[PDB]
Every structure is written in C-alpha cells, then in structure tokens.
C-alpha cells in the first residue's frame, strides 16, 4: 500500500487495494426431504421416538402455516430474491426441480425465465424415515428397546427442525444463511457453479465467510413432505481493480488575521467498478481482508471520473470538488491506513510519541502527516490516538 499526502487540501490518498465487488446473485434451490412422518403414529404414550416424531410433525405443520403467511404477504436484494422465488413457486418449476434431482443430489436447473440455478437435495431424514423408522414402529408402538433409533432420529432431524425454526422466526425470509440452510461444503459447491470466471471463484472459495455473510434465504414452500427453499449467494464478478481511501483534515491558512479553512467532504472509500467509479462514504461499508477490499455494492454511489482530479488539484474547474469552507480553525486528528493527518492550530498542543520512549516531537502549527514508521502515538491536548 502507498499513502500519499496532499498538502493542497491536507488530505491523504491510500492506494494499492484490490477490489472485490458484487455483480449478481446466484440461487441455490434446496429440497429437504422429510419423508412420510405424518403417516406414523405412536399410541404407547411417552417415549423418546414419540417426542422426536411429534417435534418433526409439529415442525412440518408450522412451516406449512408460515409458508401460507409468506404467500399471503407476497401478493434490491430481497426484491430480486422474491421475484425469482415467485418464479420457482410455479408448479412447473417445482416439478422440474424435483425431477432434475430424481437420480442426483445436485443438478443445474434452468427456469422459464432462463435463470440458471443450482438444485440440491437433502435426503437424510427421508432415508431414515423410509428405510428405518417406518419398520421400527410396528403396530403403533414407539417405546421400542432400540435407543440407537431415537438417537439417530435426533441426529437426522436436527437440521430439518433448525431450518423450520429459522424460517418461522423470520416469516419466510432469513437475514443470514445458517449452517442448517446451507453447510460449508454446499456453499463451496454453490460457489463453484456460479456464472463467473475461474479467478473470481478461487477468490470467493478462499473467502467463503464473506460470501455467506452477504447472502439470505427465502422459503419457497412445503410441497408434500419436501420442504423447498432457496439461498441467494453474492456473485463477485469484478475483482482485482483499484480501490483507494481518501482521508482529510481541516487545512487552514491566515491572511491579515482572517483565517481561511477548507475541508474535503469526499472522504471515504472509492473503487473502480468496471468503468464506473463507486464511492462509499461510511467506512463500515467496506472491509479489508489482506490486500483485498470487500465493498457492499449497495450503499455505493456512482461518481464522475473527473471527481478523481480532486486528489491532483482541489481547485480544478473540471469538477466541483466537494469541500466545506470556514474561518474558525479546528484542531483534529484523522487516522489514515498507514499514518495520520494532524491539523494543529492556536490553543492546542499537538505531539507525536512512541510506546517505548514516550514523546518524540512537538508538532508545529499547520497540517502535518505522520507515518506509522515515524511514531506510534499522536496526541492533541489530552486525547491520544494510536497509529497502526
């Protein structure tokens, strides 16, 4: 990273960051098979299997009601997701997805809209119910001497119960993708199937947490014993393009006593989203992972190419650079990725110091740029900032 100090505007541009920008959404439809648990009955009273089977049936009914509510209610991210979900809810699409996964647990499906989604099947609970539990419950007796059966029921219905709980606690649209909606291996498989080049897929597989964080899930519905839902994952199609951070402080001069202060109002993150310069005002909109900067394409603001020139000549006429003016100098510290801007004016004693030897140097009045190699701490009166 290279941090350049602009004396004209008492600012800093830090450059060298490599971008990672979202360019779309990939839909992974999931079909979780529960089996014919609603044709099983335990009439022998309290048992572990009975409690587990009651939890399972109650969950299936709760998810049916939640889907009813969601569909009675649904009559940019969640907008597109709900659109593609209404597309999938068509009977043709549901049958086509359940047939595509007739002999495989993963397939590439194509909807009527041309949308290319990934269909996945979670068949563990159906397999347990049809190939084991149904034979164990003979003549409506579930207080059997096989405790491994109850343990297995718990193990194989944990995920179904968790999915139902998360979709019911959020009315059909979860804000986050849990490990029960989509595991880590399923997430990697979804990433590998995204419509983007190899480099983006490699970068995203190496940063799966960032992908999961920006994703959500939408319940499609309960079709028989099959709970169908969908996970929308971010597709980062633009990578390794320039990003830079601008940080500023009040630049004040004096003329015959009258002060003139200027402060850049364009501070924040900037990234070259493929021919469009995008500005993120709040630094919480971007996160730094090593050399890469993940910025949320939402909350971004397109700015003209000419705005960049504010870092070369703040007084340019080719663009109205965003600045604020004043006549009352304010002393301030603006920490930059590799240092700090220090505006020191009358009535303030500013200094730079170290963690081992203490104060290094009193700063002169004006705007100074301190590097994290020159000092470890900056001080304005009694306020102390620690540099990176």
């Amino acid at each position, epitope marked *: 990273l290279k941090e350049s100090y602009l004396e004209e505007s008492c600012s800093t541009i830090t450059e060298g960051y490599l971008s990672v920008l979202r360019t779309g959404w990939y839909t992974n439809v999931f079909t979780l098979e529960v089996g014919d648990v609603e044709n099983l009955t335990c009439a022998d009273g309290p048992s572990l299997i009975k409690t587990e089977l009651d939890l399972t049936k109650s969950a299936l009914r709760e998810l049916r009601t939640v889907s009813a509510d969601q569909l009675a209610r649904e009559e940019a991210a969640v907008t597109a997701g709900v659109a593609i979900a209404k597309t999938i809810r068509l009977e043709s699409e549901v049958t086509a997805i359940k047939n595509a996964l007739k002999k495989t647990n993963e397939a590439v499906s194509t909807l009527g809209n041309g949308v290319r989604v990934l269909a996945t099947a979670v068949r563990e609970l159906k397999d347990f119910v049809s190939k084991n539990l149904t034979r164990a419950i003979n003549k409506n007796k579930c207080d059997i001497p096989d405790l491994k059966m109850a343990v297995s029921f718990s193990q194989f219905n944990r995920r179904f119960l968790n999915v139902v709980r998360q979709f019911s606690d959020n009315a059909g649209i979860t804000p986050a993708i849990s490990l029960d909606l989509m595991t880590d291996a399923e997430l990697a498989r979804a990433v590998s199937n995204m419509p983007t080049s190899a480099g983006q897929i490699k970068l995203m597989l190496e940063n799966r947490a960032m992908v999961r964080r920006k994703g959500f899930g939408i319940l499609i519905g309960v079709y028989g014993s099959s709970v169908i839902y969908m996970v929308q994952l971010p597709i980062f199609g633009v990578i390794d393009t320039p990003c830079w951070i601008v940080k500023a402080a009040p630049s004040c001069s004096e003329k015959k006593g009258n002060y003139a202060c200027l402060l850049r109002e364009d*501070q924040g993150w900037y990234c070259q989203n493929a021919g469009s310069t995008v500005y993120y005002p*709040n630094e919480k909109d971007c996160e730094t992972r090593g050399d890469h900067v993940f910025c949320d394409t939402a909350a971004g603001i397109n700015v003209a190419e000419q705005s960049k020139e504010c870092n070369i000549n703040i007084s340019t006429t080719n663009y109205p650079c965003k600045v*604020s*003016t*004043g006549r009352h100098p*304010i002393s301030m510290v603006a920490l930059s990725p590799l240092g700090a801007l220090v505006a020191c004016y009358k009535g303030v004693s500013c200094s730079i110091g170290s963690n081992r030897v203490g104060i290094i140097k009193q700063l002169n009045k004006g705007c100074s740029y301190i590097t994290n190699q020159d000092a470890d701490t900056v001080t304005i009166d009694n306020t102390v900032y620690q540099l990176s």
Partner: nanobody
Amino acid sequence: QVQLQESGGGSVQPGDSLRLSCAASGRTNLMGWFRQAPGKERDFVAAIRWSTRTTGYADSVKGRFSISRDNAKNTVYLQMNSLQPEDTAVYYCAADVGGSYSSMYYARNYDAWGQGTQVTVSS
C-alpha cells in the same frame, strides 16, 4: 433523535429572493437543506457542521444562496437570492444528532428530517 421545524417558503417570481428557517428540538451538529423537485430526486443544497465549523454548498446553488446558523437556538437560516424556475421544489431541512464526521453532501449521513417547505418560481 431531534425533530426539526421549518418555515419561510412561498410562491415567488423569477429573479426574486426568499429566506427559509429551520429550528431543532435539540442539539444539532450537521444541519442543512436538501431539495426534491417535482419528478426529480432529492439533492443537497447547503449545510453547516459545528464540529468542524465549516459550511458547504452545491454547485447549482453556490453564489445565489447563503447558509447561517445560531448555535444557541439550534437554528439555521438559508437566504435564497436570484431564484429561477429551476429552484422550484420542496426544500427539506436535515440534521444529525452529532458525533462522527461524515460528508455533508449525502442524505444518508443525516438522521433527522423535516416535512418540507414549498418554493415555487413562476411568472
């Protein structure tokens, strides 16, 4: 949060001038004026920040308008001279309870908003 009370609008003719006022129910740091015109989107007109004691205007308005503040009354005044048909809009007063710095030129950085005041230029 703070509630903002605006005033001063009107129906004025090309070339004439108006003055708008906006007072706050509490302490404000960044206080300014945006404007949304019929059919267009909300745009920045001018703001003052007290943390940095600085003032900014948009390019469309610089030279015509002027913004001033009374810190004791948490009040902000906006003089609007040489008003032309293209300044016809609903001007909203915006404010920020205070704290961290952030650009004045962007509405997302303001958390308090008024209902608006009409300014109509014609004939």
